[PDB]
Design a protein around this ligand. Structure first.
Ligand code: SF4
Ligand code: SF4
Ligand code: SF4
Lengths: 212, 148, 93, 66, 184, 111, 191, 359
């Protein structure tokens, strides 16, 4: 039209009424979520060791209230510390959907912002983590310093405080569900759980051992 | 203190160009842009180092060249002016917009001076710059801050 | 003497549930390993042993010496019950 | 079981005095002294929790003498 | 036995007791940590924070594009045949696509590109990282000129012997750079 | 099994949905466009995506039901939704908590 | 304190029979095994009202704490048994047992209300943990020692009945005519 | 269907005072004074967890929230109340919600036993060191309905593993109380601390029961603490155990209710084996972990609050020793966990009961 990728006008008045009592009960709603938010102990590529160095003694993890919870339900924040390929891209959306709705992804490193150095010619790399999940803070680096991600926590902590308590309803996903029927043949699952006792490892087959 | 009222909104209606001083640990600036967002003001939190010349990004259209990364050609994405195209999208029931420039420690002193006088010439538009740090959240006008 | 008025209130707050409860009536293997049973089986034998020793040990100096040899025949015969469970690999996991 | 005679001196008065001690010498404290520092937080904790947002332990602005 | 079982407990519960003596003596040590937003650790002399750019020094060579691992920086230049010398009109490196390998500041003929000290670049928007020529041509945030941050030094910058940055009242690096210009 | 193709906007599951829980099927392919509300939709453009969703499922009904082939439908759907932004049909949602502009920034036509 | 003790009886006496109707009538067997603890906790709460503080604590420790746990470890070992559930199995004899139980309950309530009980107005139980352990060694000494032999034997057999014979599984030790291992020599035969 | 009218008959008949006397919650002041001391007993143990574990790792711990982390137990507990707790999709609903309730209401009801302070006792029941081991055996049931109702395979494996661990360590914990119930000639927790109030320190039960304190200490920490616990699935025997699908306010019962269980365990080490509300001579010098004078206003306010809270102060030492044991012992596997409460802690708990006798 006249402007590509436009911004839709918010037609609602956004009447965010707040007296002295609700604003005091909103500062506690935000302070309790920024000062104790728990990151899922997650990371695929090299950038997790710049995130695991922040668990250590030199740069303190649990100083901003970060406790690394290795389960998607008990965690809220998810620092994407690794390159997302074609595999692990369904796994990451699953760990993001398995989360209580004040989530706050932060990207980490160049390969979750734009898929940084695999953004040029690489056949299975998601070019940026926000092709999959909505992100709050970005963090350039390859890898970032452990000081550099604690600035991205500080940028995240400044973003939790802006969140009003009356906007808890917009944190839930909406289901514009459509359905369609197809005629694609279902394939048997190629990855079955047997490796060693598969019927091809016990002995070399005939019409192969004659040339051996 | 804890139970801060709406005195931060009143100074932004008066000065127009505020200069916040936040604790560096973060989390205590944004309670003052909830008082601002409850009073009708929409907020556009930008990052101050990412802006180039403030006249060419804010009030003018700018040709933002994306990363072609050797595979594309040199595209020029003309984005609309930031403080103009965002004024034409908030409803006329709501009040103006406030630029919440985080990381304002790395702006030039001739860039706060442009951000000070820009709130005068543009109706219903304010700025808040998070320049410097202090143990308690305190603000002052940007015309005061370019003096010291 | 205040826990019983508290303990009344823990049950008096759940009388609304008892009204609604009476209206309500009117590729995933877990492998069968018998150690979940066998660890609670030997627990049932010894949680029942230990609850017999609580009336003995409270009134211990008020019973005598023949009531101490009597409690030994209780205990020393379930030492045999414990060392049966070791040798027969009941509590092996 | 009084209102604040032998309770207000524990909840309001003496926690502000431990906070004068905890803010001063916690990181610069000794090894024998820090065992007493942990006990002062542990004993006066219902008072230290009440006057918790009314004291900040953030360090002072640096001099920048250059 | 009934005596062997009660005496099989003392051989371990003493060894646990001299395990708690070690762990309590781990609490005797000062916490060797870096409180981040109030004690930012000083980056090295070769740390590649982000790139700085000089628009009056870039003569459109495109060596930075050809040595970048992903051909990142967008050199936008016309030829300007009246002067017969290509004067560029826009320059931008999109951080966030940047790995900070700094091949551009290394194969630079004019010393125009240069790494800064600042790692504290982190935005809410991805497209706010697309730094302009006039956004890369700014002042790096020096850590020591902050009146909130007490900057602690790094290892391989402390003097010889000390392995920490907190008990450091003064000093310099571990060895002099030209002591043997007047000496030898 | 739940063969699924979940990008940011186009979630295609192989099955039908009963209130969040997805039962894997063989005939159906459920689809909810834009789970996190990054785009402000309307009924005129939602029908255009739903007509595109019927178009690709009927076209690719000779292939095999794998997660590769569902990822090709959700790719062409997400390429179609982005063309509805560059046509100015739908727009970015400002009521969303995050404004990262995943499908390109707003930009004017020909300066 | 009389009205608070009276209406907490029917708060617990209704809680036990609703949980007892829950363990019997529920279609899910796992829900029955958890409501079975609701039977036992209420009766253990009913002993506190009946001055039986030891047997109340002995019911939580054994019934709730051990027997209900042992039910649940065995409920969740048999969950893949039968998902068929032909509740109308062969006939409607599931309602033929509804009149025999109500006939028993009508019989007992005919007895309970009309029998003159010899209520003794003696001040009861001065710390009845010493009057319950003096009975373990004076009056009921011989039940108390034999209950130890009962628990040994209930441990010998149930370990034997529920162990997996990994010592020698294919061991038909001899034969006059062939007998399978761990099976009785009377072989099944159709005349 | 004769009982259909029955449950609504005494419902409204009790509801007339169940709403009328509903506002007067904790009308006794020593019930409300206990619950504040009950809450700040737990809120220390979350602060003392993150601060002692940081001290043994030479990191700080939570700064920047409160003065020095004083509000870090509060924000970690308040974010879980604010999180939108949504059930898993294919799961049970009633068994999922009462999952954490059966685990933690036992360690809340059996908090009524502990007589912390000479002038704060809620009820001296006829037992209570036996009512505690009876009530804490309801907790293996809640680990079975947390495992079952979460409806994934890995939490059934974690539910059967957490239940069989609590099964194994309740029976040596029962006999460790049987040692000090034999010495005290009763189960009354006021009567138990009265036998230790004769000589101050030299009449404590840890001086008389050196093995039975160790049987209680290993069996208590194998049912509340983090050291012998496979709920961290670092061995990957499960995904994250039975506390896997639990988020929000239901996980807060699994999170903060494991610190009620740590304090209540530590509150009974300092009742049974150490004299509850017992302490030496008050008028001591400056080196008595106190001030510098002999009669301070800060020392008349100490012993007035130490008179109401001394057993919890003693319980704050064993909370500290439980964290100091976490970073000392190895994270032992489940095959050697259940070979300890049956093959080691059960004979030496039975031997100690015979050695508490004459034998
Ligand atoms: S940007 Fe570098 S450090 Fe980060 S994930 Fe990619 S390769 Fe690893
Ligand atoms: S490599 Fe350096 S000198 Fe060459 S065009 Fe780029 S900035 Fe200019
Ligand atoms: S920072 Fe490194 S990767 Fe990026 S443009 Fe410069 S040389 Fe290339």
């Amino acid at each position: 039209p006249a402007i590509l990728n436009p911004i839709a006008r918010p037609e609602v008045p956004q009447e965010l009424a707040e007296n002295i009592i609700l604003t005091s009960l909103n500062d506690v709603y935000d302070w309790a979520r920024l000062s104790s938010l728990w990151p899922l102990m997650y990371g695929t590529a090299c950038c997790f060791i710049e995130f695991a160095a922040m668990i250590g003694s030199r740069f303190d993890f649990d100083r901003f209230g970060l406790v690394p919870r290795n389960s998607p339900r008990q965690a809220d924040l998810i620092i994407t510390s690794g390159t997302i390929t074609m595999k692990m891209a369904p796994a990451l959306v699953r760990l993001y959907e398995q989360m209580p709705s004040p989530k706050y992804v932060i990207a980490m490193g160049a390969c979750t912002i734009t898929g940084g150095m695999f953004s040029s010619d690489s056949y299975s790399a998601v070019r940026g983590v926000d092709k999959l999940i909505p992100v709050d803070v970005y963090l350039p680096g390859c890898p970032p310093r452990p000081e550099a991600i604690m600035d991205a926590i500080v940028k995240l902590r400044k973003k939790i405080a802006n969140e009003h308590i009356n906007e808890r309803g917009n944190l839930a996903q909406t289901h514009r569900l459509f359905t369609a029927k197809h005629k694609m043949k279902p394939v048997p699952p190629i990855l079955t759980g047997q490796y060693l006792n598969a019927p091809s490892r016990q002995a070399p087959p005939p019409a192969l051992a004659a040339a051996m | 203190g804890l139970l801060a009222g709406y005195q931060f909104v009143k100074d932004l209606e008066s000065a127009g160009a505020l200069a916040l001083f936040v604790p560096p640990e973060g989390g205590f600036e944004g309670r003052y842009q909830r008082r601002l967002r409850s009073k009708g003001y929409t907020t556009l939190p930008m990052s101050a180092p990412g802006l180039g010349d403030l006249a060419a990004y804010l009030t003018q259209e700018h040709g933002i060249r994306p990363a072609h990364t050797g595979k594309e050609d040199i595209r020029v994405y003309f984005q609309p002016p930031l403080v103009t195209y965002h004024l034409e999208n908030l409803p006329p029931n709501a009040k103006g917009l406030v630029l919440w420039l985080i990381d304002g420690k790395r702006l030039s002193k001739q860039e706060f001076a442009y951000l000070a006088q820009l709130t005068q010439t543009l109706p219903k538009f304010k700025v808040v710059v998070e320049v410097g740090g202090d143990r308690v959240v305190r603000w002052e006008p940007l015309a005061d801050w370019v003096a010291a | 003497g205040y826990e019983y008025f508290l303990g009344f209130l823990i049950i008096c707050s759940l009388v609304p549930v008892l009204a609604l409860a009476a209206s309500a009536l009117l590729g995933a293997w877990i492998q069968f390993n018998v150690r979940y049973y066998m660890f609670a089986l030997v627990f049932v034998i010894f949680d029942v042993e230990t609850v017999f020793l609580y009336p003995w040990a409270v009134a211990f100096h008020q019973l005598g010496l023949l009531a101490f040899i009597e409690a030994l025949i209780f205990i020393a015969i379930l030492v045999v019950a414990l060392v049966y469970a070791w040798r027969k690999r009941a509590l092996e996991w | 079981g009084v209102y604040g005679a032998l309770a207000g001196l524990y909840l309001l008065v003496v926690p502000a005095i431990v906070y004068a001690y905890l803010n001063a010498r916690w990181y610069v404290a000794s090894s024998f002294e820090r065992a007493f520092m942990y006990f002062l937080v542990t004993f006066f904790f219902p008072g230290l929790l009440l006057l918790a947002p009314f004291i900040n332990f953030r360090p002072q602005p640096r001099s920048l003498n250059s | 036995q009934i005596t062997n079982y009660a005496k099989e407990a003392v051989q371990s519960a003493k060894y646990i007791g001299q395990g708690l003596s070690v762990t309590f003596d781990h609490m005797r040590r000062r916490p060797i940590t870096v409180q981040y937003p109030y004690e930012k650790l000083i980056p090295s002399e070769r740390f590649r924070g982000r790139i700085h750019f000089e628009f009056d020094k870039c003569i459109a060579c495109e060596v930075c594009v050809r040595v970048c691992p992903i051909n990142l920086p967008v050199v936008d230049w016309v030829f300007n045949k009246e002067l017969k010398k290509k004067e560029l009109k826009h320059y931008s490196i999109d951080f966030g696509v940047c790995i900070f390998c700094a091949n551009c500041v290394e194969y630079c003929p004019t010393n125009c590109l240069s790494v800064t000290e600042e790692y504290e670049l982190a935005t809410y928007d991805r497209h706010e990282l697309n730094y302009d020529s006039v956004a890369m041509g700014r002042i790096p945030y020096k850590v020591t000129q902050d009146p909130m941050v007490t900057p602690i030094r790094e290892f391989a910058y402390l003097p010889a012997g000390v392995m920490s940055g907190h008990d450091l009242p003064a000093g310099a690096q571990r060895a002099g750079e030209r002591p043997e210009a007047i000496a030898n | 099994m739940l063969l699924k193709s979940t990008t940011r906007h186009v979630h295609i599951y192989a099955g039908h949905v009963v209130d969040g829980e997805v039962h894997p099927d063989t005939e159906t392919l459920t689809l909810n466009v834009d789970p996190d509300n990054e785009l402000e939709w309307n009924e005129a453009a939602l029908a255009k995506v739903e007509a595109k969703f019927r178009e690709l499922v009927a076209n690719a009904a000779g292939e095999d039901l794998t997660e590769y082939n569902l990822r090709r439908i959700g790719s062409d759907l997400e390429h179609f939704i982005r063309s509805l932004l560059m046509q100015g049909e739908i727009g970015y949602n400002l009521n969303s908590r995050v404004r990262n502009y995943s499908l390109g920034i707003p930009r004017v036509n020909h300066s | 304190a009389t009205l608070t003790q009276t209406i907490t009886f029917f708060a617990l006496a209704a809680a036990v029979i609703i949980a007892a109707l829950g363990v019997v009538l529920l279609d899910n067997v796992v829900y029955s095994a958890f409501l079975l603890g609701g039977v036992f906790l209420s009766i253990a709460g009913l002993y506190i009202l009946m001055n039986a503080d030891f047997v109340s604590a002995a019911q939580i420790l054994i019934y709730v704490g051990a027997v209900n746990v042992l039910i649940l470890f065995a409920i969740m070992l048999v969950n893949k048994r039968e998902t068929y559930t032909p509740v109308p199995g062969r006939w409607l004899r599931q309602g033929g047992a509804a009149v025999v139980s109500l006939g028993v309950f009508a019989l007992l309530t005919k007895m309970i209300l009309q029998t003159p009980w010899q209520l003794s107005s003696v001040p009861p139980t001065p710390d009845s943990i010493t009057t319950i352990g003096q009975h373990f060694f004076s009056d009921f000494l011989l039940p108390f020692e034999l209950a130890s032999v009962l628990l040994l034997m209930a441990l010998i057999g149930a370990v034997v009945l529920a162990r997996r014979e990994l010592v020698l599984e294919p061991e038909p030790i001899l034969g006059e005519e062939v007998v399978p291992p761990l099976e009785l020599p009377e072989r099944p035969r159709e005349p | 269907x004769x009982x259909x009218x029955x449950x609504x008959x005494x419902x409204x008949x009790x509801x007339x005072x169940x709403x009328x006397x509903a506002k007067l919650l904790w009308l006794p002041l020593p019930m409300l004074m206990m619950l504040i001391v009950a809450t700040v007993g737990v809120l220390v143990a979350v602060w003392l967890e993150r601060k002692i574990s940081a001290a043994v790792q030479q990191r700080i711990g939570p700064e920047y929230i409160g003065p020095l982390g004083i509000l870090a137990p509060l924000a970690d507990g308040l974010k879980l109340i604010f999180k939108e707790d949504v059930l898993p999709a294919n799961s049970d609903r009633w068994l999922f919600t009462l999952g954490p309730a059966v685990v933690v209401i036992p360690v809340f009801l059996s908090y009524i036993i502990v007589p912390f302070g000479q002038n704060l006792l809620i009820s001296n029941l006829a037992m209570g060191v036996f009512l505690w081991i009876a009530l804490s055996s309801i907790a293996p049931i809640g680990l079975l309905m947390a495992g079952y109702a979460s409806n994934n395979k890995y939490s059934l494996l974690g539910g059967l593993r957490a239940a069989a661990q609590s099964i194994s360590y309740e029976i040596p914990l029962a006999l460790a109380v049987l040692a000090v119930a034999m010495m005290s000639n009763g189960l009354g927790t006021v009567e138990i601390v009265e036998q230790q109030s004769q000589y101050g320190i030299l009449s404590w039960n840890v001086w008389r029961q050196p093995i039975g304190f160790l049987v209680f200490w290993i069996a208590a920490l194998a049912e509340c603490e983090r050291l012998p616990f496979d709920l961290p699935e670092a061995e990957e025997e499960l995904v994250a155990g039975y506390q896997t699908e639990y988020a929000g306010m239901k996980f807060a019962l699994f999170y903060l209710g494991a610190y009620v269980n740590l304090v209540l365990s530590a509150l009974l080490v300092s009742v049974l084996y150490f004299g509850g509300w017992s302490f030496p001579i008050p008028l001591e010098t400056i080196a008595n972990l106190l001030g510098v004078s002999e009669t301070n206003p800060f020392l008349q306010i100490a012993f007035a609050v130490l008179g109401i809270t001394m057993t919890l102060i003693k319980a704050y030492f064993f909370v500290f020793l439980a964290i100091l044991l976490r970073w000392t012992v190895p994270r032992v596997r489940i095959d050697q966990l259940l070979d300890l409460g049956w093959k080691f802690l059960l004979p030496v708990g039975l031997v100690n009961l015979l050695l508490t006798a004459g034998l």
